[PDB]
């Protein structure tokens, strides 16, 4: 039952990311962290499957997804900083001008 238990560990992290999106409509920083939780869960999936199949391709991709996650976080927080610097606040009511 090993494979199912590791899988459900990763799955709970993924669902927690989804819920964190669902539960933070005023908190866009936590939304970015929920996306990072989903990415972590996917990385875990790849590593667990690599072990389970005796195949190395899951580990190569896990390392590359690590690089991608780091780049995404750096750019994401830069955009957060310039959004805050322009507006003076992070409240969602100040980032809703574009619509229709």
């Amino acid at each position: 039952m090993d494979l199912i238990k590791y899988f459900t560990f990763s799955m709970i992290i993924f669902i927690l990311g989804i819920w964190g999106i669902l539960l933070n409509r005023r908190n866009i920083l936590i939304m970015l962290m929920s996306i990072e939780l989903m990415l972590l869960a996917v990385n875990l999936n790849f590593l667990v499957f690599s072990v389970s199949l005796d195949d190395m391709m899951g580990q190569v991709f896990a390392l590359l997804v690590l690089t991608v996650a780091a780049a995404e976080s750096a750019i994401g927080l830069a955009i957060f900083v310039i959004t805050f610097r322009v507006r003076g606040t992070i409240a969602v009511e100040f980032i809703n001008s574009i619509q229709g």
Binding site: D54, D55, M57
Partner: protein, 65 residues
């Protein structure tokens, strides 16, 4: 396990089954001709039928107890 690279530095556990299935599919114009090799590869991947059979044995033991 279709790449061949094993996680301990040797041929992957399920590579030979993959290669059998691939070589069969390279000349058999019907996929159904290579069904047995395909389910051999997938059985290697997940051990579904082996574990199902062992669970049958365990269930019968629990029933006779």
């Amino acid at each position: 396990m279709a790449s061949g690279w094993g996680i301990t530095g040797n041929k992957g556990r399920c590579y030979d089954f993959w290669m059998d299935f691939s070589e069969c599919m390279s000349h058999c114009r019907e996929p159904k001709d290579c069904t047995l090799l395909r389910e051999d590869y997938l059985e290697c991947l997940h051990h579904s039928k082996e574990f199902q059979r062992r669970n049958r044995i365990y269930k019968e033991e629990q029933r006779k107890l």
